[PDB]
Structure 1
Amino acid sequence: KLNILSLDKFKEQEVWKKENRLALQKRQKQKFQPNETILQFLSTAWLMTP
């Protein structure tokens, strides 16, 4: 019983660690200016019908 308790605790800890690593990577990927206005230029192929 005690070992099952410890095992579920360890599983939760491992899931938390992996998710936190993924979140840190995502936060690293999102490096940009905070809450600033942005000017965007877009060009794309546009389909046409009569």
Structure 2
Amino acid sequence: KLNILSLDKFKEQEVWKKENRLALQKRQKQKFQPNETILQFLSTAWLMTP
């Protein structure tokens, strides 16, 4: 029973490793924040006709 439990913990730690590496890969560095609390200008081009 203890050894079967150990195999189950091996399975759970390997899926933990899988989700950990997935989170590490998806974390990325998309946090430049080039905005701040300053005066910012926005320009958009679109053609609406309803």
Are the structure 2 counterparts of residues 2 and 21 from structure 1 closer, same or farther at C-alpha, using a change threshold of 3 Å?
same
C-alpha distance in structure 1 between counterparts of 2:2 and 2:43, whole Å: 62
Gaps spanning 5+ residues in structure 1: where?
A: none
More helix by share: 1
Gaps spanning 5+ residues in structure 2: where?
A: none
Are the structure 2 counterparts of residues 5 and 32 from structure 1 closer, same or farther at C-alpha, using a change threshold of 3 Å?
same
- Shift of residue 24, structure 1, vs aligned partner: 0.6
TM-score by length of structure 2 reads: 0.57
Q: CA RMSD in A?
A: 3.7
What is the match of residue 30 of structure 1?
A: 30
Question: Once the two structures are aligned, what percentage of the paired residues are identical?
Answer: 100
Query: Aligned runs of 1:30-49 on 2, under 5 Å?
Result: 30-33=30-33
- Shift of residue 28, structure 1, vs aligned partner: 1.3
Q: After the TM superposition, which parts of structure 1 deviate over 3 Å for at least 4 consecutive aligned residues?
A: 29-32, 34-50
C-alpha distance in structure 1 between counterparts of 2:34 and 2:44, whole Å: 27
Q: How many residues align?
A: 50
